[PDB]
Amino acid sequence: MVLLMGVRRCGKSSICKVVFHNMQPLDTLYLESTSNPSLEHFSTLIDLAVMELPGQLNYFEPSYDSERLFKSVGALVYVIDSQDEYINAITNLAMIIEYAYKVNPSINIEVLIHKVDGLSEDFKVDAQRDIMQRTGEELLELGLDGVQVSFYLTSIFDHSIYEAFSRIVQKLIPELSFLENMLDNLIQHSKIEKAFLFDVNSKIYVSTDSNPVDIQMYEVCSEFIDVTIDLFDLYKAELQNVSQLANGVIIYLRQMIRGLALVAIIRPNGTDMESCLTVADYNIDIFKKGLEDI
Amino acid sequence: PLGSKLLLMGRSGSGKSSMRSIIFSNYSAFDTRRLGATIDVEHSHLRFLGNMTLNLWDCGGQDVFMENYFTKQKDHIFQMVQVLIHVFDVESTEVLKDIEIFAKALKQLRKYSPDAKIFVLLHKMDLVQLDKREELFQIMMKNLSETSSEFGFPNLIGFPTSIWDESLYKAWSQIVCSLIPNMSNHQSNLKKFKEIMNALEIILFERTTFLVICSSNLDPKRFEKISNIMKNFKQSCTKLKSGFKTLILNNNIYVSELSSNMVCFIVLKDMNIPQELVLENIKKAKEFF
Ligand SMILES: Nc1nc2c(ncn2[C@@H]2O[C@H](COP(=O)(O)OP(=O)(O)NP(=O)(O)O)[C@@H](O)[C@H]2O)c(=O)[nH]1
Ligand SMILES: Nc1nc2c(ncn2[C@@H]2O[C@H](COP(=O)(O)OP(=O)(O)NP(=O)(O)O)[C@@H](O)[C@H]2O)c(=O)[nH]1
Ligand SMILES: [Mg+2]
Ligand SMILES: [Mg+2]
Secondary structure, three states: EEEEOOOOOOOOOOOHHHHOOOOOOHOOOOOOOOOOOOEEEEEEOOOOEEEEOOOOOOOOOOOOHHHHHHHHOOEEEEOOOOOOOOOHHHHHHHHHHHHHHHHHOEEEEEOOOOOOOOOHHHHHHHHHHHHHHHHHHHOOOOOHHHHHHHHEEOOOOOOHHHHHHHHHHHOOOOHHHHHHHHHOOHHHHOEEEEEEEEEOOOOOOOEEEOOOOOOOHHHHHHHHHHHHHHHHHOOOOOOOOEEEEEOOOOOEEEEEEOEEEEEEEEEEEEEHHHHHHHHHHHHHHHHHHHOOOO | OEEEEEEEEOOOOOOHHHHHHHHHOOOOOOHHHHHOOOOOEEEEEEEEEEOOEEEEEEEEEOOHHHHHHHHOOOOHHOOOOEEEHHHHHHEOOOOHHHHHHHHHHHHHHHHHHHOOOOEEEEEOOOHHOHHHHHHHHHHHHHHHHHHHHHOOOOOOOOEEEOOOOHHHHHHHHHHHHHHHOHHHHHHHHHHHHHHHEEEEEHHHEEOOOEEEEOOOOOOOOOHHHHHHHHHHHHHHHHOOOOOOOEEEEOOOOOEEEEEEEEEEEEOOOOOOHHHHHHHHHHOOOOOOO
């Protein structure tokens, strides 16, 4: 279970709908205020629950109903605005993870430096690489320095809400290591150079190669899901799409088990297309078996 | 002959530059906000279908510039026009002043270029709710169609247009096509190409802007949405530093370059013929046929 929290108006519910309901980013600039702890469920199979506690109660805040819930929590997603209020939310977090770490030691603390819209690219390094300092300093007080901390650059209009939610939702996965391995080299007995599993209705990369990503490769593939899905939907009467660029780079998407989909960048270095596709297709059929076994 | 003057006139803020940027400058709708005001005419010599040069006169719409176009520069702005494309902000505060300048223009077209093609676009339509859109259009057109029929023009053609949907593509496809000389040919070769493939349908798209050139024959807005989807994808392939060349979807849809100036969107009747046979045919086809 992912637990989404912050302080009112930050971005905890706009991204809760912009991602799982597959909503538009516009229709959230005037959304209301979800006080009730709403437990939604989106299925990346096995199903992943997402609650989103209302962002207040003066420094959460030890109780039978603060320990009850973190016992079932898998990772704590602390969203954190950046139109303002940069400083208090930090201490909020510090405490919130202080009690959290003695209820669940296996808990992963994930913080979103959210709302990073039109705000320069040197302004960003500013907020991040030292906001982390602000969070380590309060962790140098009543606590300890060594902790699971991770810092992303969500933007609900960017692609990176999805990249962040992926690197996150990917750690709460039963055998991330063998999915990644079996899609790593197990698909480097071919011309494929980058692979992504993908929920299609969302767009979080449920996994990727052991090659650290680069968002560029993430966008193409996701965007390619769109181009395939929108074109298909124009004429309804495998679910796969091959496309080739003028330098020869192929982009390939084939369907998997229940709204999942493989998308991979194939670099032929020289070999013809039909052969790349044949070898790739062979290993990919293997991978697909190594999915249905789950 | 192959060089066309296209006037893009209309009151300030109506969104004229925006359009130019999206269909011919790969601006995303968002991107368009930073476009400044246009000072007097801003010219563009765009190159379409390989040999056709479309010189877009994007006339600044502010009143300063605008009373110019009709007095001092009248013979300059209005001589040898092939196409007026007049655009109307629908959240416009002076609808009658707007139709006024439309008529001031149509007037000059009448002495100077009587043969000019007239199109109008009801623009910015995403700022009016769906239940009221068709009524806003129909009232509007009743007015313009007569304002225009009066000056030796209409039947007038107009479009409910927006930056935030596929409609811009329908409008500019219909607009820019009226300029293709080849048409008769393209259309016929397309027919022979559809017949060969036993194709459920084949659209032909100018390659670089992705306007629909001609279709071979359910959802009646398919063509413009394919221009849109394709144009997004085209921009996306930028992330790998190379140009889209082919795409095949299922065994159903095939999209590929023809000349360095067209693209063909082929959709087959079923999904059960193999690659080989299909992929052969498209080879000619091609430039030749
Ligand atoms: N600029 C910008 N604004 C964002 C972004 N994400 C959310 N917002 C804005 O944040 C405001 C509040 O969003 P919301 O998610 O509803 O806040 P909340 O955390 O659910 N509040 P509550 O605690 O009451 O549930 C809105 O005005 C919305 O437009 C973002 O990435 N960029
Ligand atoms: N909502 C909406 N905004 C639009 C649409 N088309 C353009 N815009 C916006 O409207 C504004 C008008 O800018 P612009 O396109 O330059 O209009 P213009 O006709 O060029 N002005 P001028 O004639 O003085 O140069 C921009 O903010 C642009 O983003 C549309 O269909 N819908
Ligand atoms: Mg909320
Ligand atoms: Mg302008």
